[PDB]
Amino acid sequence: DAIAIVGMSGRYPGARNVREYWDNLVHARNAIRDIPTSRWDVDKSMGMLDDIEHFDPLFFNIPPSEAELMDPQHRIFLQEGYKAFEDAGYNARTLNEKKCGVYLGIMSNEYGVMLNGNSFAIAAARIPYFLNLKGPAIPIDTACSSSLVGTHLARQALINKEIDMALVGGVSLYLTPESYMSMCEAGMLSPDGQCKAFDNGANGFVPGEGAGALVLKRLKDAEADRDHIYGIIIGSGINQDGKTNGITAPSAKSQMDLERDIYETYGIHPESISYVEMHGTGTKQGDPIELEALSTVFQEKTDKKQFCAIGSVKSNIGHTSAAAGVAGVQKVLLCMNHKTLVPTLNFTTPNEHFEFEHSPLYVNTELKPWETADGKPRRACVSSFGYSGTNAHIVIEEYQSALFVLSAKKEKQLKAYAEAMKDFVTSNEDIDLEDMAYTLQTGREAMDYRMAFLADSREMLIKALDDYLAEMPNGSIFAAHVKTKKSEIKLFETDHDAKALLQTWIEKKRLEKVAELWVKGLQIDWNKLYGEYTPRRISLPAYPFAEEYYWLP
C-alpha cells in the first residue's frame, strides 16, 4: 500500500538543519555565495555547506586517524543519516538487528582522488555497520536523480516486504575545481550563478552541496508503532530517456510516459495535485520540455487551469545533485506540515517556449497558505531527472509535571544539546511537554554523560535549561557521569526488593527519585511511567556532534 516517512534530517546551503531550511524557504532566502579560496582560487558561484571538514569520529567508534582518510561526503551523510533516525524517535538499541535498508545517492569520489575504504559501497554501508542494520545497503549513482531513485527502490522493497524500514538519502560536495571544469566545458552552468527556474533568462544551473535522509516504513507499521509521520508516498516510478539528441539531453516522451504511467497505475487524478517540486534546474532547453511534458499529461485528464502550483528549491539553494531529490521531498513535506506554499526564486518572465496561461500549472512566487478543498488531503509531486537519463517521479500525500532527560558521549556536547533544546523550546511556543519528555526518554539512546529535571511548564522547562547552562539553578536538576557512579546503583540492579522499590516509586510518580537514579546510570523502564494515556514521539533536535576538524593527513 502506502509508505510513511517517519523521520528526516537535512543539511543544505545556509541550513544547518531542516528547521533552518524551512525558515529560509519562508523568507525566500538565496544561499548561493561566491566560492572563497579556502575552497579553491577562482583565478564562480556555488550553493555551499559550511565546515565540511567537521566530524565526530569517536561517536561512531572511528579512529581519528581513519577520519582523515574518509571522504567528507561519507562523514557528513553518516551524521545526517544517524540524526534522521533520531528525528523519528529511534535509537541504536531499538535499531539493533532491524531489517533496515540503506539506499544512498552519491555521484563523486573527488576526495579519494586528491589522495596522492572510500568506495561508494562503503559510504552506504557505514550506517548499517554502525547500528547493526540488516537491510541491504546500496549506493545509487544515477547522477541528479540518485536520491529519488533510491527512494523508489526503498519504496519497492518495503511494499514487497523484503525490509521493514528504510533509510534513503543523498549527498553531494564539490571539492575540486576539476568538477566545475567538466560542467563549464559541457555548457551546463549559469554565468549568473543562478538556477533561473522557469524563467526566460534561464542560463544553466549553479552547483549545490547537500546531504539529506529520510526514514521510511509501511504505513500500517507506522500507525501501529505510533511513529510521527511527515507524509506518505502513494506512488513512485523510474525510467529512461533512451536515445536523445545527446546523452545528457532530456526526453519529453520519457517524462510523459513516466508521469502518466504512475498516475494511471496508482489511481491518481492530476486535478488532485496542487504542487509539484520540479526538477527545474534553470536550464535553457530543459525547463520548457519538463513544463510541457507535465502540463500535457495533466491536460489529458482535465480541462481545469492555473490550479497546480510549481516551484524548484534549486532557485533557493542551487543544484544539490545526488541530494536534490531528498531536499525537494523535504521541502514538500515541510510545506505540507505547515499548510504553506513558498516562493520559487529568480522568476521575473515566463519561459518564452511555454505559454502558462492555458496551462494546468502556474509558477508560485508568493508566501501563502496552501489551501485545499473539502477535507481532501494535499498532494504533490517531486521530479528528478539525471544527465545520464534515468528519471524518477514520486507523489506524496499529506497525512492526517514531566521528567526531562538528556545524555551525550561527552560533557561538552551534553551542554550543546541543552542549548539546542532551549533554542527549540524558546522557538516553539506550543510544544506538548509530555510528548517531548516521552521522546527524550524512549526515543534517544542513554549515553554516558546525563542530566535530568522536572517541569510542568514551558517557562519552568526553559529556566531549568538556563540554570543547567551556566549552572546556577535554584536547585532541582540532577546530573551525572555514569562511569563514576556505578556503586551508587548496583543495589537497584541486583536486589529483588530494591528493584521492587524502584518499580514502586516509578509506579507512584516519584520523579525526583527516578531522575536521581537514571543520571547515575540506572536503566529505567519508561513505560511503567504511563498507564492509560501514553504520549507520542515527536520531532526533536538530534545529537549535536562534536565539531572536530578532519582533512588530508
Next chain:
Amino acid sequence: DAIAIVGMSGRYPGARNVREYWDNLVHARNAIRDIPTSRWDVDKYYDPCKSMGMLDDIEHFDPLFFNIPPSEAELMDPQHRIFLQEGYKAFEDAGYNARTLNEKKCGVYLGIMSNEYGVMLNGNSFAIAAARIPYFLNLKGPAIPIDTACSSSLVGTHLARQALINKEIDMALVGGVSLYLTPESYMSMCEAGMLSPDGQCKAFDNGANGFVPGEGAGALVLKRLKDAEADRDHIYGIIIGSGINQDGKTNGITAPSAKSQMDLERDIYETYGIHPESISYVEMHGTGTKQGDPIELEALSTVFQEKTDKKQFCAIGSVKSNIGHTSAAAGVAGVQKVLLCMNHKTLVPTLNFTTPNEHFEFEHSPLYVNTELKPWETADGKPRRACVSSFGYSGTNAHIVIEEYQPSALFVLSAKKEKQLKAYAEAMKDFVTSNEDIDLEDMAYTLQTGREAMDYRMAFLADSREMLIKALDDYLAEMPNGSIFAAHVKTKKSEIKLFETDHDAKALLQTWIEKKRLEKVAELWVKGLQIDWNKLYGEYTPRRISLPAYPFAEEYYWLP
C-alpha cells in the same frame, strides 16, 4: 513468478566468450598469469601479489558501431567500453536486435566498483556507464549502476528480478565489469591483507591464503517466464528465488557475518518454498580466503541441516579457483558457470583443492567439494537446481537460486564494415565446425530474424552442415563460381527501388518468397531489400538460438 534468462555474453580471463569459458571449465584450466609490464612493472613495487586473472586487449573498442567519435573513446573508461560490447552481444545472443529493442522497457543494472581510468586522466560516471546501452538502443527501463563491491552483479540481478515481477519493466539487462588498471588498486588490497601471495583463490582449501584479483565483463538478458515462452525465446535457466541483506556490525567493516548469511539463505528458501535437498550444486562466493571460506561453508551447511539429515548430496565449487576474483563481475560469471553446467547436464571441477579447510568438517555435512568432471545427475524427472552466492567487503550480500528449464535454408549475415562481415563469417564457420548437431533451420531463422541487417551483407543457401561450411570457406577464400550473393547496400539502391514501390513487384516478391524461390530472395536482400522473413514459414516456424554475436572491430583506444 519465475524469471527466465534468455541471453548471455561473457568475457573472462582466457575466455573471449561464453563458449571458450565452458571449454576451459571442462578442461579445468587456470587462467591466472603473471602481470606483464605492458600493464605495470610488478618488480618496481614488489615486496613481501604479482598474479592477476586478466583480460586481453582491454584497449580495444569499435566506437563507430556505437556512433561514438573515436576521439571520445580515448576518454572512456575501458570498463564502459567493454561492457558496452558484451552488453550489446548479450542481446544478440538472445536473438534480439536494435529494431526489436527500440523503445523497450528494458532496465539495465550494471555492477561496477572502480573509476581507475578517470583518475589517470586529467562522461565517466558510473551513471553513464549504465546508460550507454539504453542510449544506444533507445531502451526505456531505468539504468542503474550498482557498487556493492563484490556482490554488485548479483545485487543488480535481484533488483532486476524484483522490477520484472512487479511489472515495472518487461526485460532486463544485468551485468558486471571489473578491471584492475593501476598498481594503486593492488596496494589498497595488499595493505589490507586480502590477496594471496600464491596468486590463487585456494577455494575451500586449508591452504586458503587470500584471493587473486580477476578481470571480467558479463551480461544476462532476463524476462518474465510467461513472456519468454510466449515470445519463443531460448531459455538458459530460470530464477526461482533471490534475496539480499547486510552483515551489519561485524568485527571490522570487511569481515563477514555467518548470521547474515544464514538469515539470507534461510529467508529465501522459506519464502520461495525451496527445500535444500532439491539443491545439488552451489556456486559459492568462495574467494579462497583464510577466515571467509569456513564461515560461508558453516552458514550454508547449517541452513541445509535445519531441513535435512541427508549427507554429501550437494556439490560445491567456485569459479574463482579457475579465473580469480572477478569482483563486480563475480556474480554474473558464477551465474553463467551454473547455467552452462545445467545446459550440458555436467558438473565441473573447482580448482586448487588438496586438503579440506581445517575449520570445517565436511564428513557430516550436506555439502561436498566436487573436483571431478562428471555428469550432473538428477533423480526422477526433477529439474536440477543450484544456488549462487556473492558477498561484498562492504557487507551487502546476495544469493539466488536457479532451476534448470525443461522444454534447403537461407543463411544471411551482415555487418557495418566489410572487414567485420568476413570476421563474422569466420565466427559462424568455427561455430558450425564445432557444433556437429546444429539445427540448420533454427540457425538460419536466427540469422534472419535475430540480427540487425547492416550495410555490408552476404547470403547463401544450404541444406547440410557440409554445404554450409563449404559456402563459408568459399566466401572466405573468395572463390565460388558460385552460389553466394554479396553486396554493399549503399551502391545498390536503384537495383531495388522497383520492389520497394510498385505494388505488382511487391506482389511478385511475395510470390517468390511464398513459392520458396530462395536464390531470388537472397539476391534482393543483400542489395538492401527488406524481407518480411515470416512469410517464409507457414505451419512450422523455427526457433531462435544462441549464435555468436557481432565481431567488433579490434581498434586500439587509450589515453589521448
